Each structure stands twice: as structure tokens, then as C-alpha cells.
Design a protein around this ligand. Structure first.
Ligand SMILES: C[S@@+](CC[C@H](N)C(=O)[O-])C[C@H]1O[C@@H](n2cnc3c(N)ncnc32)[C@H](O)[C@@H]1O
Ligand SMILES: C[S@@+](CC[C@H](N)C(=O)[O-])C[C@H]1O[C@@H](n2cnc3c(N)ncnc32)[C@H](O)[C@@H]1O
Ligand SMILES: C[S@@+](CC[C@H](N)C(=O)[O-])C[C@H]1O[C@@H](n2cnc3c(N)ncnc32)[C@H](O)[C@@H]1O
Ligand SMILES: C[S@@+](CC[C@H](N)C(=O)[O-])C[C@H]1O[C@@H](n2cnc3c(N)ncnc32)[C@H](O)[C@@H]1O
Ligand SMILES: [K+]
Ligand SMILES: [K+]
Ligand SMILES: [K+]
Ligand SMILES: [K+]
Ligand SMILES: [K+]
Ligand SMILES: [K+]
Ligand SMILES: [K+]
Ligand SMILES: [K+]
Ligand SMILES: [Mg+2]
Ligand SMILES: [Mg+2]
Ligand SMILES: [Mg+2]
Ligand SMILES: [Mg+2]
Ligand SMILES: [Mg+2]
Ligand SMILES: [Mg+2]
Ligand SMILES: [Mg+2]
Ligand SMILES: [Mg+2]
Lengths: 380, 380, 380, 380
């Protein structure tokens, strides 16, 4: 009755994640001055280049040079020896206003609570009782491995580390009436950019002893656990020099690591009127509320929207057999307890607050008690 | 016992899909001359701009100006009145060689069958017997609605249409022992870019009568079906002028429309050594082989890889309760019948052939009898 | 005793001149809000692209998209059929603050009158009594031919004209004691971008009859005058699509058409602290004052500066033998009547006023009674 | 009877000169493979960015990444501490084919000797017997000061130097029957980018003792000579980070430093069919031939062209009163001894040879016995 499942995560300096963090730094900069800024900022990164492309209508005055470079500084790309430097890279801006055709169809002259969805689309929320975070263990572990790398880089204990990293965790699970129970870690991959001087065996030893053993409980690790540590053998070239980055190319890392489902919308660089972000956050909030409220052990929530229409087109609940209530009963509970219009979600989840850069690495869910991580007490 | 499920699709001129098609036009151009080209081409589109960013190591001599502009021409952006013109747009190129650190870790000096995966990652394949295409009805219908729009644009019957479109279909389903049975279409959204002269009622009438009724069987449509046709009210500004596009931002449209699962990897712009594409195609091939072979009615396949390692790290089969065989038995059948090393997949699926631009709109699966859509006869 | 001399001019839609006008539109936009803006804006134009690159420190909030596109609109590039369209081109911005090392060395904490030169360099002013404009006839005629083309394009009498044009005029001169006396026009070149439908003979006839004869006095034209009208035979592709443009690549067209001398500094995109512009304008003002004041018939003025130093390093006067006073006496007159510190020039010539876009085609000198064209009454 | 005259030069790492050298590195790369390449390559430089924009029709396969980065390496921008790094900067390419309308009008189906001029324009050549180089002393000295800085940077004796430098020299002259005789150096400016650690007095002392005294004969220097050494006080930020660069923005530095005249055409990035380069080189060759041949002491030559026309429209000779022959007699000598069609100049001056990057700093004239610097023996 056992099965394997694998999830990955990436570090702050992974080129796609650089772009997500920059896009959200831009969003936060606008929101600091104009809580109602309309923001759709994509970022592209390649050798020596950050390009901002998209649509922003805002009363803010934002110094894009400063904002972008400070985000890259935070990540740790501060010298040409590392392959990228915030001080000397190119920052190019191709930002126009929001289309007035979109603006008139979505929000102009509308009461805030009755703003239309900013686009069509579908979104999913998921929660699982297998961890206190209500997240899959596979991705929780994958994120923590990248966070550990960044910690040891920043505190100087592994000064050969660079910011670009990836991890991948395969867990063997059993199932119990639709819920999932982690048994052991089957395989771990870690690849991380490094300096020219450190040798491969020193890196592999450090990744096992100072990273894996520091993060993963020993009860999950055994003689049979497979380790692929620096499996390429050499990773000196990294960041955008090694691989182009784009915003919204880590959408599964941002969410549930292959578990649950995804509707395809990226989060970063978007204000609350973009339901790709606000409704996915709300859907997580619903899912987590159902599990922490004791109605399910595991649950998937779908919602969908049409551009210009406030209420969701569809809502669906899938409980994997882990509730005594029918899925229809859970749907009725959700409909009685949540208002999933974007102009109400914004109020419930405080989505005009400039906290988005903090969401843009290590997953949007399962950490930091953001509003969508604080369960709603349900009435039924 | 009924539930709703929603999927979307986008047209050829949707700015993200423009980028996928350009990236794959670039890939095909390289493969026409050098079957072993290493290609990782991202495309970004905004007002007046196509930017190519990424890594290509190839013996081909490719005229990027010509290749990009011809792809945009095919899509139909051929005049400033439409918001974008292949003849006069900017084409910018930021393409470097593949990192030699990646090359040495993945493919240099390796026997082709034993080439390492081009990256780590996870991938899923899915198949469902609800349609002959072995695809969810929701996304099949969504794709066909966009294809219909392009057909009526190109044949001149709706000359006010422009290339940028989106559709979304919500189907009410029942379930039968883990399989799903479509009952009716609950809601349809269509948004499509249009000329300045046509009025809203003419468009809405045409979208119902010439698009929806031409595509969706009447047995699925009834008095209660909800239509959101041009719901924003005005969509004259479109294509990249209205919304920035990036490669790999329609990964759910490219695959299963929210059904099954996704590991996060984009397809377009990548040669076969990128397992994001080759192994996802293989996983579809496996899933479809299991369903057409009569072992399951519905099945999800996960695989995962480490950079530089040929064999998958993990393989998992989930049959939703729709097989008499256990998931472990199906896994054994898969392991006996498929070799999921990238250097074997390339041979089985003919992945050096320059057919990729054809995959880059209307989904990669469920059409055209591509090799991954021709079931393998299973021995067990 | 006769000789030939040739000068050229270009139209508003010549790609280099597009860039000069855009750079100066940006400067004017800043000056409208912040008279003390520090501006060093270069523009690059190629197919579908305007790129702004440079350094601006200003309290203004400038919408670069709007400013750039409005300048291109004014020029007349408004449709993909013309090769460039303000509505749909790419506008990319790579603008940073002025270097703080420059700012501290030039203007920070300095009394305005005692601001240092913004850079080192040399500059020349020139005037000649051969025309009332105090300009060489060769370039006056060349400019007027381009202005005529733009006039006939804009009033619809030659609707096949596009904005990109070049002209060149060769005049036969005699000399009289260092002054020059035009005798006849020896050769005229006109090349102008055109639509696909008009034939070559219609264009050549129109350029002779409606352009040349409308601009050049018949007394200068005879049986022997050589006409090279549309000499390439076909000029449908034009503007930035045909030829990349850059700011500051028409510095001889901007000034004296090969007569006098040039110190190499471009004018457009620069505020008054850049002595390339302010001191060259002042030098013209000096030269014109000497000729209109009756001291010379023709005169060349050199000045030069060091970055951070207010007073010119050198001043030189060359009168071609056309004064009864020695060059040393004229130099003394200039030193007694003009203060060529940039922080005084700014006051005398009103150089914080946003009139710069008007200078950026058809020459900076010899027209419109700008302040540097109004002679100073000299005391001696 | 004395006067001052000032000329400037810039170093290899001056951002405009970076662009000229890159443009000519691109030209040379094409010519190495295809002697008949048609090349019009502009370069733009700003923080972290080299952009190539222009038109190239060539049979060569050129790796623009490699070519650009190697040119920047040669200049010495190899670390983020210097403000720019060839290894990690962005290289963007916007290169299209030559316009076919230009190609058909200029060179297609034409006998090489009878190729038309690639454009209209005017050009000047100049020579002066005041130095053995036949160049003005002011600019010769200015160039040598920059060359000295680069020498002391590269040999490690002044390791605080960076590549970006400017110099300016003012010489007091007397005249003798139209020729000019240098008397003394009146003022020298040197500004050079430097590291954060060196102090201002150490730099000023080194610039006087190790640079000026090493280059300028002591006979020209006296108690009254004015030195402006690091006059801004601080120049740590430099190269493209401090100031945008463009190709063809140092046209007076490239030529005669304000002496003679200039027709406005840039040299770098252009093949021989662009008469801006080939005819200006030829005009220098003519001028130098007249002076070294003993006909003049100082001479200015003008030539001009029309696009598509092989022979020059006009030729003019101005000898400043320094010949016993009339200017008409010298013109007749020039016409009997030189064929100034571009398709003949190419043969006489060997202009398909890839030696152009070597021309792109320290002036195109007066050094290295390039073909246009080897006087032609005149018959008359
Ligand atoms: C392997 S690259 C993707 C494929 C790549 N675009 C190509 O040209 O083959 C994807 C990511 O893997 C990581 N990476 C880059 N170089 C690597 C190396 N030498 N070894 C292992 N991982 C690497 C970085 O995180 C990078 O963003
Ligand atoms: C709505 S836009 C995305 C949000 C947008 N970036 C913004 O600034 O608000 C996404 C897509 O919707 C479609 N779209 C663009 N303009 C639209 C309009 N006026 N009405 C409906 N759909 C539109 C296009 O397919 C476009 O790529
Ligand atoms: C001839 S182009 C310069 C050379 C060009 N970059 C090349 O690739 O050969 C310079 C200018 O000449 C004009 N021009 C462009 N196409 C032309 C044509 N077909 N005939 C005549 N003049 C043209 C435009 O004003 C353009 O900016
Ligand atoms: C002074 S900058 C030109 C004006 C500048 N674009 C601005 O924003 O004010 C021109 C050149 O002077 C030199 N330069 C740059 N920074 C300097 C400084 N702090 N001191 C002296 N010269 C400098 C470099 O050679 C640079 O290319
Ligand atoms: K989702
Ligand atoms: K990538
Ligand atoms: K997948
Ligand atoms: K977008
Ligand atoms: K000047
Ligand atoms: K050009
Ligand atoms: K010249
Ligand atoms: K500049
Ligand atoms: Mg990626
Ligand atoms: Mg979407
Ligand atoms: Mg998108
Ligand atoms: Mg991936
Ligand atoms: Mg030009
Ligand atoms: Mg200058
Ligand atoms: Mg400059
Ligand atoms: Mg020219």
C-alpha cells in the first residue's frame, strides 16, 4: 500500500525565483505609496540583465533602479565572481499603464466589494494534516533544505555557497482512508552553485552533514536513503548567467509541490484584483480552515472566475474520502462561511499590505501565519 | 454525487502562447539543421517587442529575425491596427551558449542512451477515458473554442476577430468508481480581441451561434447553461500591448486543465534532454497506454529526475480506483514496458524531429497522433 | 577664384533625428516640472524600438511611454505601412541617476553662477554674412528642402511621402577678402522615403517642381545644375527599420554643415550644465554678435572647459581676414562683453526653458530668434 | 599674432570609445570570414549593457557574445569593482539584414569599381606639417596622454587606474603664412577613473610626473602652464555606469581635434561601401600626400557623394595660403592622381582587411602607417 511522491524547491538565487522576488519588490514598492495600485509586473533575468515588462497604473513614484537592485542585493548577488552583481547589472524597464479596456471592464466606477475579477481563470487550494503546516512533507522539506543553504551562506559557515540552489525530496508514504502518512525519505537531491576553489567531496560531505542532517529528522533517514548531492559534478556558473529566469515559472514550488492541483496562474507581480493570486490565497485559506476545523484530513478546493464578474463561476470541494460529510455538504459549509469575491477577499486577507516580497521564496503557503494561513472558525 | 470542474484554454495570439510558439519555432529551426542542438529558449513579449533569452549550443545557423517574424505572421499579427505587427516589431536576442558546467554534467562524452537528465524535476502524465482523445472534456472543449475562433478569423467570416483569445469551460460531472462522466456544460466564458467597429451584441450573438454551437454538442447545452461572452465589455487593445507574455506561463493549458497534476516544468523552447518536456511526454504516453490498454479508466503517472542521472529517481502510478490491479502491479507493468531514460525516450518518441511549433498551441496532448499519443501495446 | 562647398540636412523622420527629438522631448518634459533637472538622455532607434539610455536626476515625474510616443506621433510615424508606429513600437528605458561623483564635482553646494562645467570639451560658434540668417547658404537650403518635404507630406499634396528624408546642396562660391559669396547651386541631392504605389518619375518630377523650385531661388539654378533625385531608385523601407538611429549622430547638420568647425559634442538630451550645448549656443551668440555688430563678415569662435571649472580654459577668435581689428582685439571685445561661465549663460540665454524639442530638427542655429540668435549690442 | 587652440582625446574605456571598438570588432569578425560583408553596426553601452543595433548582410557566422565580450576584456573592464565586467554584462543584439532597397541602389549587380556610394554625405581630410605625423599637436598630445594612462594601468605601475579617461590640451601657436607653429602648452586637463583607495594628491602627483612629463616635451611646459588634474575631485564611478556610450560620438577625437572640418559621418562599425569611412580615409590620404609631397604646408580637402552614385559630387581643396599653386591647380593635381570612387578606394587602401578595431581608439589618423597614412607619389 506504499507509494513514492517527489517535490522540489529552489533557492532565493534561482533565476526564476529572482524574478518572482523582483516582481513582488516592485509590487510592494507601489503598494507602500498607493494601496490601490494596479500591478502586473513580469521580470526576466539573463546574464547581466533584469528586464521589467508589464502594466502598472499607480499614483506611486517608484525608483525601479533602486528597487530592483536592492532585491538582488538581498538575494546575495553582489560581485562578478558570483556571476551577477546588483551594483553593475543592466536594469531595463518596459512598463506601460494597465490597458484602459481592462480597467473599464474590471474596476472603474465599481464599488470595491463588487470589483470584477481581473481575469478569467481557475485556482486551487489544498491542505493536508500530514504536517502541522498543513502542507505536504515533500515540499516542506525541500523548502527547508534551500533555507538552510541560504542560512549557512549568510552566516559564513559555508562561504563557498552561492545563492542559486535547487533541492528535491522523494518520500515514501502509506495511505489511511484517503489521508497520507509519511514513512521515510527515499531520495534527496541538492544542487547548489559554488565557488571555484571548493572540491566536490568537501561539498558533498557538507551537504549531507550540515544541510540534510540539520533539516530532515533522522527517523526519516536510513541506510537505504539515496543522496544525489551535486550530481552534475560542477556548478560554478549559476544564477541568470547559467539559466534564464522568468516570473511565474516556479508555480508548483510556490504552491503544493505536485500535490493537489494547479490552475496555472502565477502569483508574483500581481495586485489583489488578479484572482490568480487573491483567489488562490483564499482557496488555501478555505482548505486549511476545513482541515484545522476538523471536517477533513485532506482537501482540494477549486474556484474559477470570468473577467469583470465578481462572484466565482464555480466552487468545488474534493475531500479524498477523509470527511464524514459529503463533498456537497462541505461545499454548502464553504458557501455559508466565505465570500470569494476579490473585493471581499482583499479585506479578509489584507491584500493591499506590502508583504509580497516575503511570499516570493520558500512557498506562499505553510509559513509565517500570513492571513490565508490563519484558519477561519466555521459556522455550520 | 455531482461536481463542477473548470478548465481554460487560450488562442494562438494570447501573448503567453505567442511566446511558446516563438520558442518552439526557434527550437525547430535549430533541429532542422542540427538534430542534437541543445536549446533553452525563453521568449518575452510586450508592446512592439519580442525578446529571446536563454541558452543554445548548436551547429545550426539560424536567422532569429526571420524565424521570430514568420511565427508572428502565422499567428496573424500583421498590422499596427491589431496592436502588433511581425513586419515592424522589435526582435531582441540575448542568447548565449549552454553553460559548460551543465554540458559536462549532462551529456558530454556520454553514450546517447545514457545521457543524464538535463535538470532535476518532477513530471506527471494523465489520461481519462471520458473522451476518445483520453483528455478531460473541459479542456478539450476550451481548446476547440479557441481553434474555432482562429478558423472563423482566418476564413473571413468574422473579420472583426483578432488573434488574442481566451475561453473557459465548466462541466458538471458525475463519478463512477473513480472514473468521471460529463453530464452538461454549466458555464462558458469567451473573451476575444476585436476591432473598433463591431458592437458588443453582434459579437455576443456570433460567439454563441457561430462558435459555441459549432463546437459544443447540443446535448451538453441547456436553458440553464451560463454564458459569459465578452464579459469585460470591450477588448480592442490586446496581444502583447494589452498584457506581457512569457514562455511557459500556460503550463496547465498545455497539459490537463487542472485535472491530474503538474510538476511545474514548461515545455516550449526545450530540446529532448530537458526532461520537463521529454519525460512529461513519456508520462502521457504511459498514462494513455494504460487506459487504451484497458488496465485503467483514469490514471496519473509521476516521474522525477536528478540532473546528470539517466534513470528516473521515482515512478508512481495512481489509478483513482479504476483498475482491478493494484497500483503496485501497474507500476511493475510500467517498469517492464517502458524505459524512461531521456536518451531512450528520444528514440521511442522521435524527439529530434522539428515538430515542436505544432505542439505550442491547443495543448500538447490529445491531438494529432504525435508519438506520445500512440499507445504502446503492453506485455504482462 | 571659385570653389564648391557641400552641406547636408535630414528630415524629422531620419532615424538619428528621431532620436535627437525624443531626447529633447524627454529633456523638455523634465524641465516643465523641474527647471534644475540634470538630464543626459541618449536615444537609440531600430525596427520597432526606442531605447532611452542615460542619466537623469530630477524632481519631475515623467511618463516616458507617453513622452516618447507623442514625439514619434509628431514626426509622423503612425502606421506599420510606414515602417514605424508610435502606437505599437517598443519603448525601453535604461535611465539611472546622475553619477554622484559627477554631481559633487560639478554643481552640488555651488552657487548657480559658479557651477562648474558639466564636462571637459571644446565648442565652436560660427557666423557668416552670406545670408540674413548669418548661416552658410548650403545648409540653409538643405534644411529648407527637408522642411518643404515635411510641409507637403503634412498638407496632403504629396501623400506618398514618408517622414525619413535627406538632402544635400553643393554651392559654387567666390571669395572676397575672406568672406564668401554664393554664385549658383551646382548639385542637389534629395532622397525621401515613399509609399509602394508611387513611381519613380512622378517622384522625381515632384521633387524638382514642388520641392526644389519652391525653395531655391531660380537665380541659383541653371541648365548646368545637377539633380540627383531619388538616386537609389527605391526607398520604401525607411526610418529606423532601414537604418539604426542614435542621438548626437547629426552634429554637423545641427550646426554649420561643414563650415566653421566642431568640437564633437552633441546637443540633444542635455541640460544647460552640459557645456556641449550651453557653450556652443553661447559661442554662436558671440559669433553672430560680432557679425551683426559690423566687426567681421565671417568669424569662428572656439571655447573650451574642464569638468568642475566654471570659466572657460581658452577662448579664440578667427575672423578669416574679414575685420579691420586684429583677432586679439576681437578677443578683448568678447572678454569684455560676454561671461561664458555656464551658470551665467543659463541666465542670458534662458536655458532652463523647455524649448529644446524645437531645436532638434532643421538646425539649432539660424532660425526662430532663439536667445542665442538675438545679437548682443557690444561695448568697446 | 599668437592664438590658443584646444583639442581633446579619450581613453579606450571611455564609454563612447568602448562602443566604437565593439562596433569595429564586429566589423572585423565579419570581414575575417566574408571580405564583402555589408556592415552597419551601432553599439550602445550603459550600466551592465552592450546593445548592438544595425544592419549586417554577410556570409560570416559570428558569435556576437564572444566578439563583444573579448573587446571589453581587451579594454580592461573585467570586474564589478571597476563598474563593468565583460564576463557578466548583458549583450543584446538587434541586428537585421541590410535594407534590400539600399542594397539594390548601391551594390547589387554592380561591377565592384562602379559600386555606388553607400549613402550621401560630405567628408574632409586634413594635414598639417606641424608634426611628423602630419597632425595637429594638440590632438597628438591628447591621444598620447590617454595611451600613457593605459600603459601605466596595464604594466601595474599605477594599479589604481581604470580604463575610462579623458584628456584635453590647449597649445599656444603662432602662424607663418597660413601654417601653424606650436609655441607652448598652455593648459592640460586629465580626468581618469580610479579606485576607492587612492587619494587625490597621489593621483595628481602621478598624473603630472608619470603621465604629463613622460609624454609632453619639457620645452612646451613652463611655470605658467595650467594643470587641471582630476578637476572633479572624485571619479570612482566610470565607464558606462557613469555615462552612456554610443558609437560615433567621438568623431572629432577620431579625426583632427577641431582643426580642419568634419562632415558628420562616423567611422566605426561600417564597411568600405560607407563613404563616411572610406572617403574620409581617402581624403586624409590626399591631404597627407599634398603636404608630404611638398605642395602645401597645411591643407583641407572636401569630398561629397550621393547614394548610388560612384563618383564624388564635389571635390574642394583649401591650402590656407600655404602653396605657391592655386587651389584650382591643386584640385587638378588631385583629380589626375586619385580615383575617389569607393570601389577604387577599397583597392588602393585595402579596405576589406580586418584592421578596423585597431583604428577605434587614439585616432584614425597620424599613426601606424595604415594605407591612408602612406603618401602617394604625385605626378604633375
Ligand atoms: C539546469 S538549468 C536548466 C537548463 C539550461 N537552461 C540549459 O541550457 O541546459 C536549470 C537550473 O539548474 C541549476 N543549474 C545551473 N547550472 C547547474 C549545474 N552546472 N549543475 C546543476 N544545476 C545547475 C540552476 O538552478 C538553474 O536555474
Ligand atoms: C486580463 S489580462 C491580464 C491582467 C493584465 N496584465 C492587467 O494589467 O490587468 C490577461 C489576458 O486577458 C485577455 N485580455 C486582455 N485585455 C482584455 C480585455 N479588455 N477584456 C478581456 N480579456 C482581455 C488577454 O488574453 C490577456 O493576455
Ligand atoms: C543609407 S542609410 C545608411 C547605411 C545603412 N545603415 C546600411 O545598412 O547600408 C542612411 C540613411 O539613408 C536613408 N535611406 C535609407 N534607405 C534608403 C534608400 N533605399 N535610398 C536612399 N536613402 C535611404 C535614410 O535616411 C537612412 O537613415
Ligand atoms: C562627465 S560625463 C558626461 C555627463 C553625464 N552624462 C552626466 O550625467 O552628467 C562624460 C565623461 O566624463 C568622464 N567622467 C565620468 N565621471 C566623471 C567624474 N566623476 N569626474 C570626471 N570625469 C568623469 C567619463 O569619461 C564620462 O564618459
Ligand atoms: K491554482
Ligand atoms: K530557463
Ligand atoms: K508535469
Ligand atoms: K502577464
Ligand atoms: K562645437
Ligand atoms: K546608422
Ligand atoms: K569628415
Ligand atoms: K553620454
Ligand atoms: Mg526555469
Ligand atoms: Mg491565467
Ligand atoms: Mg500570462
Ligand atoms: Mg524545473
Ligand atoms: Mg546615422
Ligand atoms: Mg564630449
Ligand atoms: Mg558621449
Ligand atoms: Mg551621414
Amino acid at each position: 500500500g506504499t507509494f513514492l511522491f517527489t517535490s522540489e524547491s529552489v533557492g532565493e538565487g534561482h533565476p526564476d525565483k529572482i524574478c518572482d522576488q523582483i516582481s513582488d519588490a516592485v509590487l510592494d514598492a507601489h503598494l507602500q505609496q498607493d494601496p490601490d495600485a494596479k500591478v502586473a509586473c513580469e521580470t526576466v533575468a539573463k546574464t547581466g540583465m533584469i528586464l521589467l515588462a508589464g502594466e502598472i497604473t499607480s499614483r506611486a513614484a517608484v525608483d525601479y533602479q533602486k528597487v530592483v537592485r536592492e532585491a538582488v542585493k538581498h538575494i546575495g548577488y553582489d560581485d562578478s565572481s558570483k556571476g551577477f552583481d546588483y551594483k553593475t547589472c543592466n536594469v531595463l524597464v518596459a512598463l506601460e499603464q494597465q490597458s484602459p479596456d481592462i480597467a473599464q471592464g474590471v474596476h472603474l466606477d465599481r464599488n470595491e466589494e463588487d470589483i470584477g475579477a481581473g481575469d478569467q481563470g481557475l485556482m486551487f487550494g489544498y491542505a493536508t494534516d500530514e504536517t502541522e503546516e498543513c502542507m505536504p512533507l515533500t515540499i516542506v522539506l525541500a523548502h527547508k533544505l534551500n533555507a538552510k543553504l541560504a542560512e549557512l551562506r549568510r552566516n559564513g559557515t559555508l562561504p563557498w555557497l552561492r545563492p542559486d540552489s535547487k533541492t528535491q525530496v522523494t518520500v515514501q508514504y502509506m495511505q489511511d482512508r484517503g489521508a497520507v502518512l509519511p514513512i521515510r525519505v527515499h531520495t534527496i537531491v541538492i544542487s547548489v552553485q559554488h565557488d571555484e576553489e571548493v572540491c566536490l567531496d568537501e561539498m558533498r560531505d557538507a551537504l549531507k552533514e550540515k544541510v540534510i542532517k540539520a533539516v530532515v529528522p533522522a527517523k526519516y533517514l536510513d541506510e537505504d536513503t539515496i543522496y544525489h548531492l551535486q550530481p552534475s559534478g560542477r556548478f560554478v556558473i549559476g544564477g541568470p548567467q547559467g539559466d534564464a529566469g522568468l516570473t511565474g515559472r516556479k508555480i508548483i514550488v510556490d504552491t503544493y509541490g505536485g500535490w493537489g492541483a494547479h490552475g496555472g496562474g502565477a502569483f508574483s507581480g500581481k495586485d489583489y484584483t488578479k484572482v490568480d493570486r487573491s483567489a488562490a490565497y483564499a482557496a488555501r485559506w478555505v482548505a486549511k480552515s476545513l482541515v484545522k476545523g476538523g471536517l477533513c484530513r485532506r482537501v482540494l478546493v477549486q474556484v474559477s472566475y470570468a473577467i469583470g464578474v465578481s462572484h466565482p463561476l464555480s466552487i468545488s470541494i474534493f475531500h479524498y474520502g477523509t470527511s464524514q460529510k459529503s463533498e456537497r455538504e462541505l461545499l454548502e459549509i464553504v458557501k455559508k462561511n466565505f465570500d470569494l469575491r476579490p473585493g471581499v477577499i482583499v479585506r479578509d486577507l489584507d491584500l493591499k499590505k506590502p508583504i509580497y516580497q516575503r511570499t516570493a521564496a520558500y512557498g506562499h503557503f505553510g509559513r509565517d501565519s500570513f492571513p490565508w494561513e490563519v484558519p477561519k472558525k466555521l459556522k455550520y
